[PDB]
RNA sequence: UUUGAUGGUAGUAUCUAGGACUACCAUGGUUGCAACGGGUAACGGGGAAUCAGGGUUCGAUUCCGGAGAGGGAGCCUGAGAAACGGCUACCACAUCUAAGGAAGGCAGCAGGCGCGUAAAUUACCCACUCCCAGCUCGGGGAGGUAGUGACGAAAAAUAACAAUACAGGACUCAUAUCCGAGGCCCUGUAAUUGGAAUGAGUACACUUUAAAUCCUUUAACAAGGACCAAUUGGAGGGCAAGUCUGGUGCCAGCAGCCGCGGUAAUUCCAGCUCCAAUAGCGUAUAUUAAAGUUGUUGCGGUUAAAACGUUCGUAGUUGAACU
């Protein structure tokens, strides 16, 4: 497989303790890569404990054979859970909360406008 | 004044309705322009045809 | 011939061509408001209507044939016009008081050929596209 | 929003539609380059007329005034980097002599025939649009790829292709699949 | 210009100038260089369509500005509103009512009726761009994102390489507007047959994204035409294209115009073919070019349309040389 992850546009910043990096991934024989096995071999790039890799952005070139994609390396495991647009941990699966469902929720906040303080209507019928 | 109108469709109850039954899906756009390219150059008589036509019978 | 060739006659020139454009028959046709007052079409390409009677227009001589037109009242402002139907068949396919779609004929409003006065042309009848039912690719519903 | 389809529209239909002495000038252009139809023909004629009017209205000014030169050299460089015109003819007059029948042979659908690989100019539309061609690393699936001048050194196969053998047909796989049935 | 019109003057009023409003004087102010009035199928501008130039037509429409939320008027709070996803009334429409009464404005996003030639989902989320709040975190049908989508732009399926079958000219050569051999630097028609490719689909997984789908990337499947089967128009001229065959007989009809048709039709209706542009193309209305038929560039006025019957004449337009 071996994926030949070669990295460019490399720059680090301790403004948010990160390593900005775009990586060139080659697709030699089979298909486009899956993200979770790039992790432990980009944890063979600098050995940065593969659950803190977060290499989430990719697009395969035309014809088949290449992929230039973004990889932001946090330094610590909870600086990875500090700044972090939270739907990126929705991909690196740790979070799924609160069905709303963004239509039933936006009629919750309008139905409970006709109560006064106590909200005695939410306890009876539902 | 006006006589009548019911003489409409006199041809359609008169023609003996012969049909085609066949004819062969042909070479379309990419290959149509090379079939008709050689028909500009298949024999190409190279003659003054004495006031003739390109695709008549004779 | 004529025109003032002095340096400060831009006042006269744009006055004149404004004055004299009102002799042109093509300018003044589109600048008088009669695409709504005189046009039984509502200043537009098509119109819909409901027919009244299927009639025979006597064609202008040298040609001599009754021409099988249809006199229709369009619903936009209730005016009653006469349209021509093409492609013989075309009146055993009408069956009077079906809703019709009507268009122009081609000479930018006024009449065209051997048919005197008739300026409009029937396009669809009862939604089923008269040019396509003439070649029997669509069938008019028996409902 | 925005203007999204910012047109710069090609595919100009001809002025007078039927007359033969221009209709059959362009018909054997489809013969010598096995094109699709007439819209590929006047597309480059549309492309030729814009660089002409550029070179026309540049020629209405004097050298050395910097209006003429500075859009001048950017015109001829984009031609010779493509390479339809070349390095002996590098001023504003020889571009006016350029007609279309050298522009329609700088396309990659004819470059694949000028090297002994296509075996037909009508096979060359099929081989390009079957993902069996490559320029310099890139697999290209269009006939109208205008090639650059130094890019001419690198049109080869891709070895991504089933020639020579990667899933080799796969009608070659079907060669030994028709036997068990 | 009574009932502010133009100015002076003192005031009031407003955040402030000001006839903005009041009181008193003055009689001004605009006008053929088009005022005033009317029309407008008029929101203005950036800009859009089309030409060699000069131009004509359009601009409801994503950007700036104005304007308004059924029709008018009024107004509260607020730094900011004459706010209507605030209130108050009248007018018009509608709503509930146990008949006392109570509330309503989708020219926000979707959706329904209606009018119509004429215009899509009662979908998903704030990851984006930014905005707002007490404000790293909430909210935002602003916004992004799928579903409809031939308005419009772009790249391009509908075959390709060979064999013999039958066949053409041409190349060598018997020969020369006759004629054989290698038929051939040829091409067609072959449900002859046998081969090489392949994306169209399809399907594991992948990438994709807020979560997705589609494309791209894709392990397995997938072409022999009988099918994965391209149609829209025309074949008198203008206008590239059968003096084809049956039908009808100034009929039916066709035709933008010219013209066709009256028991031989190059124009109808069909068969057999052919030609144009091609995932397109035909028709209708408008508009630009064509138009040297609106003429500044650039027309015409003896007879084709056109020098006032005549001369004065103000506005206007044009005006000798000289430093």
Curated annotation (Swiss-Prot), chain C:
Keywords: Cytoplasm, Endoplasmic reticulum, Hydroxylation, Ribonucleoprotein, Ribosomal protein
Classification via CDD domains: Ribosomal_S23
Main location: cytoplasm
Subcellular location: Cytoplasm, Cytosol; Cytoplasm; Rough endoplasmic reticulum
Keyword Isomerase on entry: no
Residues the record lists as 3-hydroxyproline modifications: 62
GO cellular component: cytosol; cytosolic ribosome; cytosolic small ribosomal subunit; ribosome; rough endoplasmic reticulum
UniProt feature, compositional bias: Basic residues: 1-19
Keyword match Endoplasmic reticulum: yes
Self-association and partners: Component of the 40S small ribosomal subunit.
Protein name per its UniProtKB record: Small ribosomal subunit protein uS12
Curated annotation (Swiss-Prot), chain D:
Region Disordered, annotated ranges: 162-181
SUPFAM superfamilies given in the database record: Alpha-L RNA-binding motif
Entries under InterPro entries matching the protein: Ribosomal_uS4, Ribosomal_uS4_CS, Ribosomal_uS4_euk/arc, Ribosomal_uS4_N, S4_RNA-bd, S4_RNA-bd_sf
Gene3D superfamilies: RNA-binding S4 domain
Subcellular location per the Swiss-Prot or TrEMBL entry: Cytoplasm; Nucleus, Nucleolus
Subunit-level organization: Component of the small ribosomal subunit. Identified in a IGF2BP1-dependent mRNP granule complex containing untranslated mRNAs. Part of the small subunit (SSU) processome, composed of more than 70 proteins and the RNA chaperone small nucleolar RNA (snoRNA) U3.
Matches recorded under NCBIfam families: PRK04051.1, uS4_arch
PROSITE patterns xref list: RIBOSOMAL_S4 (PS00632), S4 (PS50889)
GO MF, any single term: structural constituent of ribosome
Similarity comment: Belongs to the universal ribosomal protein uS4 family.
GO cellular component assignments: cytoplasm; cytosol; cytosolic ribosome; cytosolic small ribosomal subunit; nucleolus; small-subunit processome
Job of this protein: Component of the small ribosomal subunit. The ribosome is a large ribonucleoprotein complex responsible for the synthesis of proteins in the cell. Part of the small subunit (SSU) processome, first precursor of the small eukaryotic ribosomal subunit. During the assembly of the SSU processome in the nucleolus, many ribosome biogenesis factors, an RNA chaperone and ribosomal proteins associate with the nascent pre-rRNA and work in concert to generate RNA folding, modifications, rearrangements and cleavage as well as targeted degradation of pre-ribosomal RNA by the RNA exosome.
Domain S4 RNA-binding: 106-180
Protein name (database record): Small ribosomal subunit protein uS4
GO BP terms, alphabetized: cytoplasmic translation; ribosomal small subunit biogenesis
Domain of life: Eukaryota
Sorted UniProt keywords: Cytoplasm, Nucleus, Ribonucleoprotein, Ribosomal protein, RNA-binding, rRNA-binding
